[PDB]
Each structure stands twice: as structure tokens, then as C-alpha cells.
Amino acid sequence: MDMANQLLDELAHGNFSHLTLNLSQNGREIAILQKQLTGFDDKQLETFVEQHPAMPNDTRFKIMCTSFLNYARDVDPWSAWSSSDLIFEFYQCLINCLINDNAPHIEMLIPVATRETEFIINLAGKLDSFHLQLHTRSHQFLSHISSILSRLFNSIKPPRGNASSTNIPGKQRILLYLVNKLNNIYFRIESPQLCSNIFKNFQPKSMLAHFNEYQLDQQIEYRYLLGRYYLLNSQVHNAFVQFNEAFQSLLNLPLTNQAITRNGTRILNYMIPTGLILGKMVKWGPLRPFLSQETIDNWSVLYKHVRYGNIQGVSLWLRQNERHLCARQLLIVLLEKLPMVTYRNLIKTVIKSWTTEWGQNKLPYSLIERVLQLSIGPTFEDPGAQEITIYNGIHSPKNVENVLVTLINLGLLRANCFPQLQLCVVKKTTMIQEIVPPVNERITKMFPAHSHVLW
């Protein structure tokens, strides 16, 4: 039996059971098709699609079918590179069949498009790893995929304000799926700022009235990627609400797979430092199934150093953890934003005994300079470390007034400064929270994040 004619019947009637680039699912049928299609030139295949009965009178659809016939005819299963032109060509045609909202067999083509999207993403990574041997630039294949998915994303239109049906068109069903796929691509090619447009046009294109109406897994991944983006722009609160809601939503999911536990671990790897910057420390109870004991010990060491005002402790912890923190884009933001919390707790313990217990309303700069001598420890000026480092070049016990001034400007210390008296006056009181308020409330009030529930 003519298997090309048969396949063209199936494709002409929206039966895409054999329309796939995955030879692990299509191998035998594609082999038969390859033996039967050998002989025919490109124009003969194009004619096979053009003159086929019941074939939709769509140029892009017929281009897709012809491209799949070229693939099946010329595919070399022994060489992923030699067959890559056919594979990527057919993928681009397939996505082209989705740009028109009223394209033929659009609803049947969408699942095919998602399937082939996962396949072509895997193959695109595989081929990008050999960019030197293939004479291609870095991430060229996957970036091409990102362009295709970007045009598909632009083609998705918002709902009509007075729509006549509640039909969720399949282009809307995969909207968040496409957003997370595209943003993940932008993260893997190491150009995550390209997510910006994708994040800006997501909600305007969505027909769903609430963000919680998408699949909760896609919600979790979206909050994860959005939080990582925010954190890439050093917006710690905006990232924090996204990581937090992501991990809560993950706690609601039934723990079916190990990959869900590892995804929760991926969320925590960012939620713990982001929270710590905002003065929040986790309770390890609900985090036992997602974190090893050694990770908990590490973050607990950092927790002690920040909690009791040990700047040298914090810088030492960042120094020992430098590599993996740089891998997750975490070192710079912690190096910059953990110090003010650590200082806050340092002068918190100082003002506690000095003011609430010993009844001294004044904080001389010499006292805070000795305290900073204990907390900071060595600096670039000091001997034994004659080369400047991010861990010894920033913090110096000489800059008492600067630390106090930043603490007061961040709202972490309610006090007045006297530079010519060289002292810092707090309010005479026994309650320490009146002088040093809760840090998370102050930070979140000064930096109000966007709505944690998107919409």
C-alpha cells in the first residue's frame, strides 16, 4: 500500500498520529515511507501534497506536509547533524501552521507542536554542544528555536472583550507553557533579559481571568523564572514573593515524582538567600523533604553569622561558597545586600545591652568602632592580606558614621547622628523594637513588591 498517500489522507483529515520528528515513536513507519519515497524529486512530493484529495487549501499547511515528506525521504537516522536541516525546517513549517488563528486543523496541530517543541529543544541543545565542530556560533540552534517560538508567541491574541464562546483556543491553552519554554531557552542561552518582552506581554495576551486558573505546575515554573529574572535585576522583594508563592504552590502539589522534589529544591536555592536578604529565616521543618542536611547546615551557618552581626562571618561564608553562588547568580546580590541586615543585628545587640539594660542613651562612635573591629575584622588596609578582595575591600571599621547613616536611611535604625559630637542618639527606652524595628517589615514597606498573586 502507498504509505505516502495514506499519510497524506491522515494529515488532510487532521490525523497527526504519525506526524512527529521522534524516530523512537515513528521509526518503522518513517522507514517504510523513506523506502517508498526514494526516487521522487522535490517537485513530485510537492505535487503529491498539492493534488491530494481533501487536502486543506492552505499554503502553509501544504508546505508543512511537503516538508515532512522531504524529511521522511531524506532523513538519516544515523546522523543527527546530517538530518538537522530537514528536522528544523519541518519544525519551522509546523509552527508556521499555528500563526493563523483559523488555520486548518489548528486544534489538532497544537499538541503536535508542543511535542515537537520538546523534541527540537533537546536536539537543539545536543547540536549546540558541538558548535565548534559544526562551525556555528554558541546557542545558534536553540536561539533559532527561540525565534520560532517568539513569532508563535506574538501570534497569540488576547480574548475579544465580548467573545461569543468560552472556547479556550489551543493557542491560549499553551500560552503559559510557551512563556515558560521561551524564558527557559533565554536562560539557557545565557541571555535572560530577553524574557522581558515575554513577561510584559504574557498577562495582556491571556484570556484567563485569574493566574491560578492555569495549570499549577506551569504557575510554579513561571513564578520560579520570574523570581530569577527579578533577582537578576537585583529586585529582591519582587523576586521573593515569586519564590515564596512558587514554593507554597509546590507544597500544595501531591509529591508524585522525584523531579518535583528537585524542582522544590531549585526554588529553595533562591528563596533562602532572597528571604535572608529581606530579614526572613526559614523553619527547616517543611523544607526537610527538599533539602539535604548539609545544605541546611550551610545556610544555617550563614543564618548564624547574619543573625548575630558577624560581617567577617558572612564574607567568609560567601568566599567558601563563591563558585556555586556565582553559578546561580547569587554571589553579588548577597555580597551587596546581606551586610546591612548583619549590621542591623550587630547594632541591635549593641543597643540592647547598652541602652535598654545599661541605660545609656548615647552611642559614641568609638564604641561602634570597637564593635566593628570585632565584627569586620581585617580590611584591605590591614596587614596579612595585601591584595584587595570583595571580602576585605568593602567593609572597614573606620566608617562608623557611614554604617549608621545607611542603617537610618534604610529605616533599620531610628536614631539621630551628631558628627561634630561623634555620637549617635537613640530614644531612651527599654523596648528594643522601638529603636531597631523588625527588619522585614521596614524593607517591605520601603520596597513594596508587586502583587504576589499576579491576577
Binding site: 524542582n263 549593641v350 570597637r370
Partner: protein
């Protein structure tokens, strides 16, 4: 190995208070806090 260590979420077939209320009030004597308190006592004593 790369699927488990990479930051990108893994694919899986689809089918609470976790933060400290306040760590300022729950105070625990720390080693560093002990040396800091001792430094506060020595400074309080040299500056009588």
C-alpha cells in the same frame, strides 16, 4: 547528571507557614555574641 543539577525545571507528568514568626525575640547566646558582650563590658570599663 545535568538534568538533576541544572537550574531549569525538570518535566513531570502532571496529576502552610514555613517562615520564622520573629527571630529577634527568640534570642540564643552565640559564641560571637559572647565575644561581643565581653567587648562591650571591656569598653564600658575602660571608659568609666
Amino acid at each position: 547528571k545535568s538534568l538533576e543539577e541544572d537550574d531549569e525545571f525538570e518535566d513531570f507528568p502532571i496529576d502552610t507557614n514555613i517562615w520564622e514568626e520573629n527571630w529577634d525575640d527568640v534570642e540564643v547566646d552565640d559564641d560571637f555574641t559572647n565575644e561581643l558582650k565581653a567587648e562591650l563590658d571591656r569598653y564600658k570599663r575602660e571608659n568609666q
